[PDB]
Symmetry: D2
Subunit: 493 residues, 4 copies
């Protein structure tokens, strides 16, 4: 990795509409903070309802029949996405540093993981631009019938702060591949990197109005998008509680299409026949990755009783050795949490676990004086009824539960209103096949964890969300299917 | 051959209760409600009035039949196909009976119930039976030493709420894809037309579907229907009906367990007649487009746009056709139009007709009540209709035709698209470029060219805008009943 | 299993054209023999070139634009296929008995396997009739581009004798689903059941000429179809030897489309961690099923050296216990071979096994005084270079080979010009994944064998064939893709 | 359009194997000529069987399990195809001139059409590299069944001289996207541009052996490919004559998989209600494009009797004004024919046309003293039974036929053993729909001609070929489908 600029300059901090930069109508700004220091990085235009209104009008205009964007060859949408990826890669080092500054994650990870996954996401979806065929259909009678795969239209996209660049990419990729237009609301904690990418969107040559980004707060800017009478579809990633607000707001306004990707309490199951070294390291990664701030974190580590003690001992050892510090320091494995709000929410869950009888094995406290750093925390002898075993913590807090039989762990892992991910570690062919089929989760990993690819869909069962992102499936929510049924003189096979 | 067997005009009712675990239950409250014959306005029988407690019992049954290792989960996908095919066979066995009961309860002409509704039900179930073992998931060439793939699982417990305009067909549109994909059902049928759907439940048991796979709770909307939309253990609701209630369905889902929602709502579909259309065909098709099923179709061509050069001719012919349209007893062979489904719709349509006269639309024929018994309305045609008129914007859902004049093709595109509805549209023209341009330009879920109301199980149906979300029929109608699971496995060495 | 009629009466023994029965033009007939007794069942019309020509004309006229078959709704093709299935299920015991009479396979197997698979194949493909969509395609420019999935046309279908009814179903299913017409040439060894199905095809209501069946010999009737100038497509199942003749004939005639399913020498691989009891019975079934007359037979049983001796001893014991006898007797597991030619060929390979030093562990001789019964035969210590280890025997003769490492057995299994099927028995996930990927075989079975379904495609790698049958894939060779590209006033997404 | 180098240098004229240049084993060379002058451009290594043998070994080795190419991420195969197109675009101006130098087509066309389509083809297929999913299949019983989409392996690719670079890209795109390796035989008339791309294939970073190119003659190098025992699949494009030879060699050797794209005699149908101006210009393009050297050329122009005289009148005027000259002169619409052999053959056909009673309306002779230039030639009053209305001329010779009715024109247009393309020009929706359905041709254009897109498949009905290239369909022939069926403890939906 190239040595980072530990204080990268900010070039974009305004509202992005029609390929131009605007202050908020109200002229208001809000500060974004460095989670490693607690210091203000800069101010950013505080978009609200009136700003969203302007973004939607611009998106609506670019989606007009006969416009440059509507008329553009599908294959050229691909060229543009590929160009956007090239421009992102050109500026990879700057963006990786900016991502760490605003979010707190280690710079090595921003560079090698986040930025790499963004490039791969955009390059993958570039390929889909001219391949998502409709159908010609053998209907009865003297008719020829077919479907057009058309864009859904103006798409509001509301994204979180845990993976700012990658969440932006996950949203823009499929939306732009299918010819939609976007009004994006980035997280108030991490607006900067997505604003810079907006400039690259312009540089890549996307028509004005095709992508519009409105930085600002949720109940203001986000709520305005979700309630807007001229937004055709909304895609939301965030908390389960705001997912309700979004869905309610859609039904209360114009019945716009909705998809959601929410939180989880994903079970990581370690059978007695698992490779212990690999299972311990993967279980550590499964929980602690990205400061524990992953919707798919394996926050319920089920370990079979015969290997429980050894697993726990090893897990505690690895958690005590996890390096917490300056995310720009290459030795650092764990940066700070994203903000003070999350910081406190995690301290409350830690205290909760102690009160309700969970066994604190290591960590459990504040790791430093400045910023929002928390010690890697491991709870043992966790029971299903416990709050730390039911609710998403979104911090470096690991729960280890013991089980006995394979049919028991099935019932206990499935006993949840969440269903985002799950994992099984075993060497047995039959146990893996039985578990992968039995687990009620959108993604099941066998002998691995947090393996994402732009090709394989991702999304939740139950209250972890609805619909899928990534892969071919990710195009479905961005398609309005039109049936054209034509009277013909004589139908033949 | 399209000949119809003489109907029993007073078909016996065998089923009038809540169907749960392949058995008939009274409402927990023991309360019942009357279903009425709209031809006379008189009660046919009492039906058990399912409420939230009855829905709870239905959902627990569905959940149990959906347990891993259950007969329905373990059943071969191909066998699900055979059960759907068996159910179709049974419905065909009782076709003459089912058609008559559909007419008794709903009001539509018997010849249509037999030749159209029952036919379409058969074709829909037989279509989706074939999908049972063909809706493949994928193996996916993901990066690295991994083998990744998707399982296409069922969503789970599916709440299904349907209207009264096509009681049997709406039931089939729901059960076909849901059962094909291995789901279980709690269905809430319209209070106006519960009977035929309940008799089909009897055939479901006879065909050998495991107990709890399909549960039907007859009853009212805000009671039974809302209990389903808000239930904490229903995974998915699919609703057909008014846009207004669709909102309620979506809010209830977000307010409860964030269940998956698909909707098929109302419309105000533009039927567009270019000056180069075949006049005779366009006239008869537009008449059918509006007046089909007593005007009680969500996709009715309730804005007939006619190019100015053929406006006068088209209107004269449409009025003549509407005047000759026979209204009467649906079991009578002469009848093209039966009564509206109930008194509420009856007065509601009459209300819209009055507004049409009020706003200056020319009443060209009909406009009133057609008989002093039942809910019959005269076939009504309004001419010189303008975009801002109430009858031009709101769904009437009755035999009331709006005819509007236009000049250019650019004009008619903007006017037809100027609607919060977008369920269907049509274009009548002989020109290749005009048909292609209009079919692409119209913001509607289904666009018909030189025809109208051409539905097929193979072709997807659903709305743009506020006419719904998602699609039914075809391969697409399986997407909402599928839960996709990605399985990603570490392998020793990935090779192409 | 309902009781059989061990002397079914024959209703059809002529040439089937335009739904009517015809004698051969030459009026010649040929005997078909009951392989259990060696007695002549009846005479069958001997179709040749002139008869094939009349069939091709019948088919060609049924395929003309505006004909009942071309105009028929796709869904109705599904109705007709389901009706034929119902008619076959009605006459199930009759056809299962006639299959056993003419072929030799046990009645219990004819009834429970062959006929059940026939019904499931036809009902599966009935579902496909109206679901094999073409595409609408986002081409560059102001154009609308789509594809029509039309039928390929007059299909010549040449089938073998090992699974007379099933092989017929495998051909008719996909061809009729997609609206093609058929000239079918059935094996001279087993013509009766297929000719009876023709009667049911008529009864079901298929239009005249949609299916035409010409019994007769290969070099006469078969070659006539293969070289025919008005046959658009040929599909052949049989020996690799004759596969070449088909492919040469097609190229020398009208360049008709060709798909082939040919022989095999399929490896069945038993790892030391396999379930012994299961692997032994399954290896036995893998080789011995259908009197060893299966293209996918596990004719190379590779066994890991740690379990070799135990596996061999158990296999020998199971082979010695395999009941040979009257196929109508409920206890018979193995009937006679199909005819004298096959009978002599199998004895020849057995002699070859002894001559080359393979260890004859049991069987090896003639098992009855009349008919074509051969003792269940097992060779041990088989080497890759032996003839019985290289060539397809198509009889109750088993080859057991010893191996040491997983990479050794991969190279050894793949060292063949055959590649139709393979199997792996193991409890280990990683081994199972590595082997299924490494093996160059059309179907790889894991902890099972000979598991077919109409849903999953089947066909060979290398010289075991080209193309696939069954599943959605089986529709590909029976479709002719037409692109329609239309100029439009203005292309919009 | 960038000013061309009228005499571009040749850097590559040898055999390409393992990313290295070789002389032929025989050390022999052959001349390639500039068809505009008749002068030799340079000598090219004359590959034969012995050289084909080295290429196959290199390809086979490159395709071995565990090789860099077999292990490479599917998405990365996409990066390589994109990189290859990037390099081709860098060298676009040079390649366009060299294409013109060796082929004779106008430089303006090479640059704007040929090179543009090459870039679009390669980039389209780069998108397919990680998206051509196999299936998970709901088979009966306690089993999990799925398909892997594997490469077919060593693919022999034999191409002609009419679109040298585009034919190469049509073959390489789908082959490399799906993980295959290639032994390509370019036409002796136009080897140079494909040889240069090979240089760029090395530079792009494709592993050695993945693409090997062998220049040389047909009956030597090409036959060696079709007859080779370690070539799994062959794709051929060229004459119907040689297509037969390829198929026979395939069936005679190792039963390699075969797909063909052969000649045509495509009907272009002008209804009386067609836009006269558009139809006249399109019909001119349909025939005369690329010096008449297109397999899909509209060489049967059917004009309705009511507009015949005017259409002919306007077509003669256009033909008479079509600029023949130096392909590097921007005003040139038609360069020379590819070589003296085609030159004489076309002149021969012209002689036949006059002899058989066709009415010569203009052209009919040589257009220059130097090179192989032919006057744009129009025959009127052409009848279906004339040699020039039946046989593929492959030159600037136009056939105009008169018809009365729709039914008549369907019969006459379909009365051909060719079926590659067709077109209908009409303003009427029903006529267009009836005709596009009734026409037995691989591609049907409506109110256009020769509209190709990498997204829409291309291939012939009848003896114009088998299988399809371009689009999703173009991946089918480059995929070997493997079914993996696994026994599971308990199958659930
Ligand atoms: C396989 O095949 C071997 C021999 O069995 P078989 O000879 O009965 O199968 P085969 O390959 O000879 O015949 C298979 C089918 O093809 C037909 N056929 C035979 N010769 C033909 C030709 N020249 N042209 C066209 N069709 C022809 C046959 O009539 C039969 O229906 C067995 O040992 C087993 O390995
Ligand atoms: N007998 C043959 N076997 C294999 N390939 C051949 C044979 N003859 C020609 N070819 C090759 O096939 C390609 C197409 O050639 P061909 O069909 O002869 O068209 P043309 O005759 O117009 O050159 C060329 O690359 C040529 O070298
Ligand atoms: Na920040
Ligand atoms: Na026989």
């Amino acid at each position: 990795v190239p040595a980072p600029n530990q204080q990268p300059e900010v070039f974009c901090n305004q509202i992005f509409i029609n390929n131009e930069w605007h202050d908020a109508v109200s002229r208001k700004t809000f500060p974004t903070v460095n989670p490693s220091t607690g210091e203000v990085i800069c101010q950013v235009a505080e978009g609200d309802k009136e700003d969203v209104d302007k973004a939607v009008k611009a998106a609506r205009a670019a989606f007009q029949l006969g416009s440059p964007w509507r008329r553009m060859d599908a294959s050229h949408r691909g060229r543009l996405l590929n160009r956007l990826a090239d421009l992102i890669e050109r500026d990879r080092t700057y963006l990786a540093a900016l991502e760490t500054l605003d979010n707190g994650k280690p710079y090595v990870i921003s560079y090698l993981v986040d930025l790499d996954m963004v490039l791969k996401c955009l390059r993958y979806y570039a390929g889909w631009a001219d391949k998502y065929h409709g159908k010609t259909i053998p209907i009865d009678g003297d008719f020829f019938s077919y479907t057009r795969h058309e864009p859904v239209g103006v798409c509001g996209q509301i994204i979180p702060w845990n993976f700012p660049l990658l969440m932006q990419a996950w949203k823009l990729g499929p939306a732009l591949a299918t010819g939609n237009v976007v009004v994006m609301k980035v997280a108030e904690q991490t607006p900067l990197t997505a604003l810079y990418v907006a400039n690259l969107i312009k540089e890549a040559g996307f028509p004005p109005g095709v992508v519009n980004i409105v930085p600002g707060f949720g109940p203001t800017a986000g709520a305005a998008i979700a309630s807007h009478e001229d937004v055709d579809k909304v895609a939301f990633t965030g908390s389960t509680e705001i997912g309700r607000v979004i869905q309610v707001a859609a039904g209360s306004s114009n019945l716009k299409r909705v998809t959601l990707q929410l939180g989880g309490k994903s079970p990581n199951i370690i059978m007695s026949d698992a490779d212990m070294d690999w299972a311990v390291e993967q279980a550590h990664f499964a929980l602690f990755f990205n400061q524990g701030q992953s919707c798919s974190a394996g926050s319920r580590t089920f370990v079979q009783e015969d290997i429980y003690d050894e697993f726990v001992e090893r897990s505690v050892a690895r958690a005590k050795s996890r390096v917490v510090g300056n995310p720009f320091d290459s030795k650092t494995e764990q940066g700070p949490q994203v903000d003070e709000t999350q910081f406190k929410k995690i301290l409350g869950y830690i205290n909760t676990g102690k009160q309700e009888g969970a066994k604190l094995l290591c960590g459990g406290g504040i790791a430093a004086d400045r910023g929002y750093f928390i010690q890697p925390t491991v709870f043992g002898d966790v029971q299903d009824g416990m709050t730390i075993a039911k609710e998403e913590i979104f911090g470096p807090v690991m729960q280890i539960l013991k089980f006995k039989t394979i049919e028991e762990v099935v019932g206990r892992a499935n006993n949840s209103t969440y269903g985002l991910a799950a994992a099984v570690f075993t060497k047995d062919l039959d146990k893996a096949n039985y578990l992968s089929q039995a687990l009620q989760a959108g993604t099941v990993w066998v002998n691995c964890y947090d393996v994402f690819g732009a090709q394989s869909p991702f999304g939740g069962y139950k209250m972890s969300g609805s619909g899928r992102e990534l892969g071919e499936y990710g195009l479905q929510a961005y398609t309005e299917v039109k049936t054209v049924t034509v009277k013909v003189p004589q139908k033949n096979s």
